[PDB]
């Protein structure tokens, strides 16, 4: 339709923003513990999928918790300590989150450049309708 380009770019921007927000939240909760109701904090990731309308935009179905084992730290003085006196610290890969943020920023800038070019082309298109 020559106008689904805007939809594709907007979906890409929204997905990149979601992924960046997830990475930022993980970085903020890198060294947290004992969230609500006492359950240990676990990191989360996002999964990108394409919308087969062929070629289509990107979407994020749901946020998936990481299955990597939590860090078990010996500290009996914490009420969260089990019979072995261990507390469950969250699994956060700082380098992984930095790389994810870098990738999200680069994809966002590429998509905004594509939007700029297509907007210029579409503005120039209407000059022939007179």
């Amino acid at each position: 339709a020559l106008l689904n380009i805007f939809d594709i770019a907007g979906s890409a921007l929204a997905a990149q923003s979601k992924r960046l927000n997830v990475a930022a939240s993980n970085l903020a909760n890198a060294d947290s513990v004992t969230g609500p109701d006492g359950q240990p904090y676990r990191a989360k990731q996002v999964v990108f999928q394409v919308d087969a309308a062929a070629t289509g935009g990107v979407k994020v179905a749901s946020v998936i918790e990481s299955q990597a084992p939590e860090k078990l730290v010996y500290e009996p003085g914490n009420p969260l300590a089990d019979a072995n006196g261990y507390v469950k610290m969250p699994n956060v890969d700082v380098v992984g989150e930095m790389v994810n943020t870098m990738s999200a920023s680069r994809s966002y800038q590429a998509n905004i450049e594509v939007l700029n070019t297509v907007k210029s082309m579409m503005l120039k298109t209407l000059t022939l309708g007179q």
């Binding site: 907007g10 929204a14 609500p36 109701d37 979407k59």
Partner: peptide
Amino acid sequence: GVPGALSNQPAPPNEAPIATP
């Protein structure tokens, strides 16, 4: 349903409980 679509009713208000009630 899908984010960014059109809905006839507002979403419930957001809250961030520090501790569970």
